[PDB]
């Protein structure tokens, strides 16, 4: 009888159940240990010197710290350009203002909101979420093509009179809303934005088109980031300070290890055609009989 | 301190909240918000390390106490 | 009745008479070196692993002594 490995696998049973935690002690998942695995019959050696654990903890520290050192770089850039201009900032966002108004207290509230936002930074925030489309698959040719289409010459009448017809006035902006009447900070916020054609400033609405109405509230402050990594930090009254976010003091494979945007493969219920309207999810559920 | 505007003469407003935004803050309200924002605001690890050195000395005293039997 | 100003690209808010800019620079340089909010997570996991291995030393000193 050439008896199968499956029956001796089951009848050999499982030795013991051992649970384990993660490093941050957030999840706690359990591990089985079957005796009839081939894990036993390879005769593995095992050892852990402490210097390797120290280097492992340092590498894991870097992997956790890449986001917060990016946020610290953002704060340093804010303070750098705020020292650089000399304290005089323009209004880059459309809001009607009054002249007789106390403005030193708005500066105090702006410093307060800046310290509060630095206290409550997280990996689920503006710059990380705006960075995730930049790490994608077709980002290189898309940015190259947008650069070439931006840097195209003035068209001659030949391509206007016989060539093909020519051709994104709104942008997908990401926002961190902080607020000091309640010390409530709001992290993952999406804002549709474009220019006001009557002037040269920006108009910020919802995806529904709400005309986002926190800018008139005197206590909030917002951080805006654009997909081309342009930077904005807007105190009430429409005045704001601008920069570029600088990530050049950071490694590349750390940025791809941490929050590189995901690419999916084909499972059941998915179109082998690329990009049609898919049907519903597979949805293996316990409410129904599982069929 | 106070702002510096481009257009010299002021303009009255007639808009709605659903139209363009405007800063209209009464003075006691901004004062009270400044009060509420103002009022809402290691070497012990080296101490633990040095006390652990003292525990190391206590432990080597125990090692010198145990081997004599 | 209400009086206001229409926004522009040439209206500028000035520095707050450099009496609040200096405390802005103070808050800039008092937090260049401090809590980085990076090794706080390392602090938590080191404290927790240290507690774990110290309790393991307790189990070892309780059983291996017999």
């Amino acid at each position: 009888d050439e008896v199968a490995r499956t029956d001796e696998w089951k009848g050999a049973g499982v030795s013991r159940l051992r649970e384990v935690w993660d490093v941050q002690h957030r999840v706690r998942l359990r591990v089985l240990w079957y005796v009839n695995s081939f894990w036993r019959s390879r005769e593995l050696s095992y050892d852990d010197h402490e210097v390797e654990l120290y280097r492992a903890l340092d590498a894991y520290r870097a992997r956790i710290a890449v986001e917060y050192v990016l946020i610290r770089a953002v704060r340093d850039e804010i303070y750098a350009v705020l020292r650089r201009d000399g304290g005089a900032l323009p209004q880059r966002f459309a809001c009607h203002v009054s002249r007789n108004m106390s403005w030193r207290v708005v500066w105090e509230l702006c410093r307060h909101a800046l310290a509060l936002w630095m206290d409550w930074a997280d990996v689920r925030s503006c710059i990380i979420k705006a960075l995730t489309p930049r790490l994608s698959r077709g980002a290189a040719a898309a940015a190259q093509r947008a650069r070439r289409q931006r840097e195209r010459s003035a068209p001659k009448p030949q391509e206007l009179l016989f060539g093909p017809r020519n051709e994104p006035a709104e942008q997908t902006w990401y926002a961190d809303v902080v607020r000091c009447v309640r010390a409530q900070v709001d992290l993952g916020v999406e804002v549709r934005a474009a220019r006001c054609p009557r002037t040269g400033l920006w108009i910020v609405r919802d995806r529904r088109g709400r005309l986002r109405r926190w800018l008139s509230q005197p206590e909030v402050c917002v951080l805006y980031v654009t997909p081309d990594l342009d930077f904005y930090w807007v105190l009430p009254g429409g005045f704001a300070v601008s920069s570029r976010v600088t990530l050049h003091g950071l490694a590349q494979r750390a940025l791809r290890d941490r929050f590189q945007n995901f690419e999916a493969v084909l499972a059941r219920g998915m179109h082998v055609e690329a990009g049609r309207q898919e049907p519903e999810t597979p949805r293996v559920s316990g409410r129904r009989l599982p069929f | 301190s106070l702002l510096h505007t481009f257009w010299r003469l002021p303009v009255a407003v007639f808009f709605e909240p659903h139209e363009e935004n405007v800063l209209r803050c009464p003075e006691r309200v901004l004062r009270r918000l400044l009060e509420d924002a103002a009022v809402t605001m290691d070497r012990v690890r080296k101490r633990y390390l040095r006390q652990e050195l003292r525990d190391l000395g206590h432990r080597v005293q125990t090692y010198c106490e145990d081997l004599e039997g | 009745v209400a009086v206001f100003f229409e926004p522009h690209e040439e209206n500028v808010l000035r520095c707050p008479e450099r009496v609040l800019r200096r405390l802005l620079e103070d808050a800039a340089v008092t937090m260049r070196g401090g809590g980085w909010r990076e090794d706080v997570l390392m602090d938590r996991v080191r404290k927790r692993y240290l507690r774990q291995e110290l309790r393991d030393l307790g189990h070892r000193v309780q059983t291996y002594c017999e």
């Binding site: - | 633990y48 090692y63 081997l67 | 030393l57």
Partner: peptide, 20 residues
């Protein structure tokens, strides 16, 4: 035994020094 206990305690304290 006793020397084994004393040595494993001093070596485990030496590796306790490489957390902090």
């Amino acid at each position: 035994l006793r020397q084994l206990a004393q040595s494993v305690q001093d070596t485990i304290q030496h590796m306790r020094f490489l957390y902090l």
